[PDB]
Each structure stands twice: as structure tokens, then as C-alpha cells.
Amino acid sequence: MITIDGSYGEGGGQILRTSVALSTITGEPVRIVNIRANRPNPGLRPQHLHAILALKHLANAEVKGAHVGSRELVFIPKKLEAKEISIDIGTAGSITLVLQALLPAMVFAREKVKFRITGGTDVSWSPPVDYLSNVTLFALEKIGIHGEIRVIRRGHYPKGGGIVEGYVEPWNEKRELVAKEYSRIIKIEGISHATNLPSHVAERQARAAKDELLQLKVPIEIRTEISRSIGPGSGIVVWAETDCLRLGGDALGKKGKPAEIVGKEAAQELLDQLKPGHCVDKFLGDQLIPFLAFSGGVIWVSEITNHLKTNIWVVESFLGRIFDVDGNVGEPGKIRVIRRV
Template identity: 45%
Template sequence: MITIDGSYLEGGGQIVRTAISLSAITKKPVKIINIRKNRKNPGLSNQHIACVEAVSKICNANVEGLLKGSETLIFYPEDITAKNFEIDIKTAGSISLVIQSILPMCLAINKNIEITLIGGTNVEFSPPIDYIKKITLKFLENIGINSEINIIERGFFPEGGGIVKISLKPSKIVPLELIENKNIEIKGVVFNQDLDENISKRIRKSASDILLNKGFCPEIKLENREGKSTGVGIFLFNKYIGSDCLGKKGLLSETVGKIASEDLLEELGTKMAIDSHLADQIIPFMPFSDIKIGVSKITNHTLTNIYVVEKFFDVKFNIEEYSKDNAKGYVISTKGV
């Protein structure tokens, strides 16, 4: 049995998500200790439990310690079965993070699966569902992972109630080398559920003005919906570089647009192929083929996922500094197993 320290580096729920995914794929049991031990509310939350339940349904796992607040989890995977199901996080817990845990299942299933997820689509401390759809899935297509997302309803904190359907399809990883980003097209969306449309327009204008001033010509759409929860925010992207900002009480609409646009410009300034948020998401897929990718910076999330992946595979990741012309960042690579 593989034992993983859940307090290592980043020490968050990502360790749990990656470990159970790889356990299901490799059929290696895993014991995770010290789960989120150094966090304000240590142990498993509803969102982490939803991740484990989703993977468990696919690999028919036997699980010990799957309780809210539990700091130890033992996961015994069985045979993979492709079946449709629904997971309700029951809070505004992140749907995006549940999707991160189940995407690797594309490498193990033998037929399509459709999973309905209920919870938060655009919440703090996790990628917005727009990022997963427009960046994560699009990048994974390049290495052979086939999946689709349909956003039925958005869910914001505290009500949640967002609904997303994801289709996983049998896939096989193919090699890829992608170091620099030469794309100059910026797109985005200001999403608004049950708030004044003028808020959306102010957010868009703020972001557009900043990007236009830097020589870009952004295409930012307005999306106005009705739903069970109320919220507003912006998501911007350029190829595999993304940024976002959620509106909240006391934060000016103009500030929301400013934060998202300036964050995007900072990432684009490195000229590297992917942003720092995508780097940790693709680490679990890299041992399956020869992949070499340029990233803006190396985060603790990325190093944490490398730690977990190297526990399951006889593989070592290489991280090298990269500087060429105007591009400056890092290159992550591995030879696969």
C-alpha cells in the first residue's frame, strides 16, 4: 500500500484528489494521512468527500475514513466500470475540483460515462468552471484526453446549486512538446446570475480598456442568467493562459475587471505556453507519454502533485529554467513509464 503525507508542501485537498485518481487507474491501494492538517479546518470537507465518492463509483472502491473532518483516508480500488451517475456536493463546494479528480479516469474506462455534478461552478479558491472547459479540457485534447463539459446552471457561494454535466471518453495519452505561447487573441466572458446587467458592462469595460491599452483587442461576451444563487464575475483567456475574478460585496465592478486583466497580462508577459494553474492540473497525465511543456512559474501546487505522482510511478520529473528571446519561465518534462 502506498502511503502519502497529506500535509506535504501545499498540504491541501489536491493531494487527496490526485492520489485517489491514480490509485483507481493503477489499482494500487493508497493511505493518505495528515489530510489538510495545517489548515484552519483540517481533514476532509464536503467537496473532498464528493471527489472520493465520484472516483469510487467508477472504480468500485472500498473506502475507510470517508467522513467530514477525517485526517486519514484508505482507498482500495477495484475494477473500473463505466456507468453514468450524479454527485451532489450539497454545498457550494467546487465542481471544478471534482472534475480534476475524475478526468484521469478517461485513461481507464472502456466506454463513455456521463456524470452530473451539483455544487459551485464559480467559487473562491478553485478554478472557475469556465477555466476547466476552455483551458484544461482544450489542452488535454492535445495529449489525447477526450471529454466534454456542459454548464447547465451556475452556482455561487453560499447557495451553490450549479449543475454541470461532463462526458468522459476512453482516451490514450500522446506525446507533446509545447514551450512558448505566440497567440495574441484574448477572449472571455462576464457571467451574471440575477444581478443588474450594468454590473456586467462595467466589469467588461474595465477589463477591455486595460487590455486595449496594452495592444490587445479582447472579445468579451456578456452572459446573463437566472438561477438558484446570485453572483457575478469575469473569466479571460488566451490559448492556455487564463485569469478570473469574482465579484463580491465591497469590491467595485471596475476592480473586478482590473484584477482579471492584470493577472492575465502578467502571465502573458512570460511568453510561456501554459499558466501556473494549468501546470499542476496536467502533472498526473505526464507519466503516460513524453510531454515537455513550458510554464510561467512553478507553484507549490505543482510540486505537490509531482510528489504524489512519483509515489505511484517509477518516473522522475525534470524542471529547468527557460530563457529565450522574450520568453522566460520553466520547462517541465518526463519520459513517461
């Protein structure tokens, strides 16, 4: 069967998540070894098990080695069938990382797939959920995918308490994405949230981000959201709407980090993403990879990330050579789908 080396490259959870997703899509069983080698705490942790179990449910799969601390996993899918998914990730485990994996699988079911996921909506080392709703879905629509991703309640580190609900439709009509350079920025929009914290936190984040983006000379509208959950947290995402795709930048609130810095950092990230003039930002760059194998097309990315390289590695391990890549990790890049499947 297809065997994936979990120590390849960046060697973390990404290779694990994408591999099971591809197994689920292709129907080909997969063995993953050396799980999370490049980490202080190697092996399967509870967060990874929730993702694995969700996909197992979707694919009626047999699974072996799916235990906390395990370094090796075998996943044998059966037919993919639209089921209602409920996932309670522990504490502030990232909803968006689970969702990034689930999305490409779910759109290959024959009927609408609804989901509810609890955990962290806005945690470090992953995209904020508002990025998925407003940037990722916007891009997926271009290739024929339709869905919703809604924040019912925010969850931050460490307490969690987040609730996300949504659905995707079956990907029946696939079309290619051709997204090289953008021509112009049309407008900036964003969402600045504060949870169990004073409303001035959301305001000051939004104001600082806006100030930092005035230089682009386009309208800027950053909505504020003040909400309730089981712990304090804040964050902001801003996105540039271009003639092609949206590019995004984000930052998370942190105890002892003033709200102005958080807002400025999100703006600076967006500015960094926009700099090369390429259509696809660094986050969307990895997220698109599993879909592009099936839609076809070409994307130019502001920055090639390890996750993008990891995703290509996995998809090609399942499907043969698919992608031509021009550029090194950390540089702007060009990704062409040579052969659509």
C-alpha cells in the first residue's frame, strides 16, 4: 500500500492530516510511519486522533495504530459516505487544522456534509477560523466548491470553548483556477474580535491595522466583534480583495501585548503577502494543493511554505507526478498542475 514517511521535511502533523485525507479521497489505504518526528513530543497526540477518527467515520475505515504515543498508523478506507460530523477537539486544539484536512475529503462525498467542531477557533500556529470563512472559501468557490464555515462561539488558548458549524456541498462541477499576478487591490475588509475582554481591545486592533494599511489607497472596512466564551482572547484578520483572489493577514491577542501591536502585525502580514504581486497568499498556497490536483490550473504564491511542499509530497505520493514547482521554500513561487486527475 501507499507508505508515507512522517519524518519527511517539516515532519509534523500536516503530513499526517493530509495523508489520511488523500487516503479518504482516493480510496487507497495508507501507512504512515515516523509520525511527528520533528517535534519535542513525537508520535500521535489526542488532537491528531480526533482528526483521524473523523475521517475514519466519513470513510467507514479500518484503522490500526491509532493510539496516543504511536509512531505508526495504518488507515484503510471503504466507500466515502456523507455523514454528519461532530468533533470535540481537546481544549484549544485547532479547529482550522482539522477543518483544512476535512474539507477536501468532505467535498468528495455524494451528498451535503454538515459539521460541528469544538476546540480552538483562534490559536497560534494555525489560521484563524475567520480566515477560512472569508479567504479560503472565497478561493474554493472559484473552482466550484460551495460551503459555509460559521463561528458560533470563540475558543482561545488555553481554555478553548470554541464552536464552529458549517457544511460543504458535493464537488460536482470542477473548474480550473488560473491565478498568477493580481492587477489591483479593490478593497480591504477585516474582522477584529475580542472575547471576555473590554471592547476597546477590538477597536484598537482594528484602528491600528487600518492606519497601517492606509498606504495602499483603497477603502478599508474592519468590523468589530465583542463576544462571550469560557475564557479571554482576541484576534484580527484583514484581507485584500483583488481582481482575482483574496489575500489575508492575521494576528492573535496575547497577555501583555498591546492591542495596537496586534493590529499592526496583522496589517504587516497582509502587506508581506501582497508584496510579490502574486494572487495566492502563503496560507491559501498550501490549502489549495489537495484541490488543485483535481481542478487543474496554476497558482503563483507569495511564499512557498513547508506545508505547501508537504502537501505536494503527499498528493503526488498518492496520485503520481502532478505538480511543477518553480521556487524554493520561503520564496515566491509558481505552481502548475501538469496533469489533472
